[PDB]
């Protein structure tokens, strides 16, 4: 069955600018500006109402109709990122060897860099480079906590996932060796 | 001057009920020997039966009481022969108890019952007796409960 018409709606807040041209969505807000290329998905964009963006698919199958929900959630995440932002709090815990975390900002590339030392007494220095637009700070309110903030949810969550996966324990019982850096909180900056 | 209430399970006529009680009443200043003596004195009516004992503790002395439970009342009303707990195990409470005794047990347990009337109280006691495994009036407690619903047996009101 091909469905003749299907549509979705995305509300836009008052202080948010949205510009779509050739399925290239640019969303600007108080916190910055984001872009996303959605040219791989067949969708007709329109302005159905003042402050509401309409998404239409004509003569589409169930798969094509279902893709519009993903497009809606992606654009809503961009809007939330430029309005409130995204923040991931991570905790690093240890048993014997204290994990040393150093955060620097590379001046030439403009990206943050996280260096991890003394992970279960290892002599190697782990280096993980954040996605651009993601800021990392060592928290002062809580013990052994990093805070990753940004406008792109995908970039923030992927940077958190890279830091989590760089400190992997190998050839040890994970019921006994509990050392690592884990995502402890997800939310908005505002 | 603070009053503490401690509920435990004890066997009547035994001093060893304080064995699991002494580690927590020791710091409270209570003497386990006299606490067990008071427990045995309170539970001398309930020889061989697992009963619930309430301890009220204030100024480092304990007052003992026996909280009545439906299972203990039914097993006491069964009037089984005296037995040795250590040598005779895996017993079954298969004797018969009268409906008047069931109604008296329900009247005793009215202070715990949330039911509206003695019919519901007697039905709760009959269900407890059915779980125990005894008979009522030579018949099944479930059958007498069904008869009380169907109206053949009249339960007095209050």
């Amino acid at each position: 069955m091909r469905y003749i018409h299907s549509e979705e709606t995305i509300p836009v807040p008052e202080n948010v600018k949205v510009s779509i041209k050739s399925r290239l969505v640019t969303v600007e807000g108080p916190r910055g500006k984001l872009q996303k290329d959605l040219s791989h998905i067949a969708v007709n964009f329109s302005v159905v109402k003042k402050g509401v963006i309409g998404l239409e698919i004509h003569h589409g199958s169930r798969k094509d109709v279902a893709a519009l929900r993903t497009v809606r959630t992606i654009i809503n995440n961009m809007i939330i990122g430029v309005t409130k932002g995204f923040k991931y709090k991570m905790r690093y815990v240890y048993a014997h060897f204290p994990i040393n975390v150093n955060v620097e900002k590379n001046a030439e590339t403009g990206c943050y860099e996280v260096e991890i030392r003394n992970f279960i007494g290892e002599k190697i220095v782990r280096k993980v480079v954040m996605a651009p637009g993601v800021e990392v700070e060592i928290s002062k309110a809580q013990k052994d906590e990093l805070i990753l903030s940004g406008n792109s949810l995908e970039a923030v969550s992927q940077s958190a996932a890279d830091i989590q996966q760089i400190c992997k324990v190998r050839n040890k019982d994970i019921r006994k060796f509990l050392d690592g850096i884990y995502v402890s909180e997800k939310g908005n900056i505002v | 001057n603070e009053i503490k209430i401690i509920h435990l399970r004890a066997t009547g006529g035994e001093v060893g009920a304080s064995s699991a009680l002494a580690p927590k009443i020791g710091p409270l200043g209570l003497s386990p020997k006299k606490v067990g003596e008071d427990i045995a004195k309170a539970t001398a009516d309930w020889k061989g039966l697992r009963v619930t004992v309430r301890l009220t503790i204030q100024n480092r002395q304990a007052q003992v009481s026996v909280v009545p439970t439906a299972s203990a009342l039914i097993i006491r009303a069964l009037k089984e022969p005296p037995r040795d707990r250590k040598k005779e195990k895996n017993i079954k409470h298969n004797k018969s108890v009268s409906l008047d005794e069931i109604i008296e047990i329900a009247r005793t347990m009215r202070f715990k019952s949330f039911s509206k009337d003695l019919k519901g109280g007697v039905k709760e006691i009959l269900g407890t007796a059915f779980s125990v495994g005894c008979q009522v009036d030579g018949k099944s407690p479930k059958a007498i409960s069904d008869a009380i619903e169907a109206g053949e047996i009249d339960i007095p009101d209050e």
Binding site: - | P81, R83, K87, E88, N90, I91, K92, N94
Partner: protein, 258 residues
């Protein structure tokens, strides 16, 4: 796992004997108003039936207790009926005759002491004298190569007959429990045995569709009784010794005579 005591006139349960962990497979009532039970929890228990209380508990067997037998079952089954074919006039005389028959059958060294033999699935029997020995068995009867199904004292109390699943019936001394002789000739497991009134003969009914009458003094197969088309489940010898009744899977009663 219970034994209930019923009053026959009213149909009311007076006592319930509980404490067994398995099915109570056999019950006897002795002349001292003691109830003996054997159960599948490898236990043989003695109860006072007036109070309904447990007096003795024996846990010597290693598997299911199949059968129990008393030294005075032959006179306890018949009470005051005996060879005279006449009954006493009054109930007191009848009770006195029954009591004196029980005492004559149950006297051990001048005092009344009922002896109990228990046949189990651990290939063994045990002999108990609760009056004189208590919880210590008189003897352990060994020699069967398979489970023992039925066991019975002789009417004179000198012999014990046991039927086993090893195709054999064995004879034992009823005093010290020593093995005497083996009655060989059955080809399927022997299910039941029964004594004659004069303690000369034992009839055994087996799974091999046959009854066999054995002379115990010569230790020989006196008579062979075929005719059942299927397995034999129940065998009885009459108290006056006139008839032997058998029944089983062939759905027909068979009475045998001399």
């Amino acid at each position: 796992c219970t034994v209930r005591i019923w009053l026959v006139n009213t149909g009311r349960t007076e006592h319930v004997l509980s404490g067994h962990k398995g099915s109570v497979s056999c019950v006897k009532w002795g002349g001292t108003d003691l109830i003996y039970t054997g159960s599948h929890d490898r236990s043989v228990r003695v109860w006072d039936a007036v109070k309904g209380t447990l007096v003795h508990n024996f846990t010597a067997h290693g598997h299911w207790v199949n059968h129990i037998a008393l030294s005075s079952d032959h006179v306890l089954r018949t009470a005051y009926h005996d060879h005279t074919k006449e009954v006493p006039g009054t109930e007191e005389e009848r009770r006195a005759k029954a009591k004196e028959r029980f005492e004559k059958a149950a006297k051990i060294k001048g005092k009344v002491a009922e002896r109990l033999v228990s046949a189990s699935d651990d290939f063994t029997m045990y002999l108990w004298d609760p009056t004189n020995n208590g919880s210590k068995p008189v003897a352990r009867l060994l020699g069967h190569q398979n489970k023992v199904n039925h066991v019975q004292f002789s009417p004179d109390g000198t012999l014990i007959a046991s039927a086993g699943w090893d195709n054999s019936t064995k004879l034992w001394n009823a005093r010290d429990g020593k093995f005497i002789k083996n009655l060989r000739g059955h080809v399927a497991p022997v299910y039941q045995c029964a004594w004659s009134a004069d303690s000369r003969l034992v009839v055994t009914g087996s799974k091999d569709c046959t009854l066999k009458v054995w002379n115990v003094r010569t230790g020989k197969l006196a008579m062979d009784l075929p005719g059942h088309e299927d397995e034999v489940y129940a065998v009885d010898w009459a108290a006056d010794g006139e008839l032997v009744a058998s029944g089983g899977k062939d759905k027909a009663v068979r009475t045998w005579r001399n």
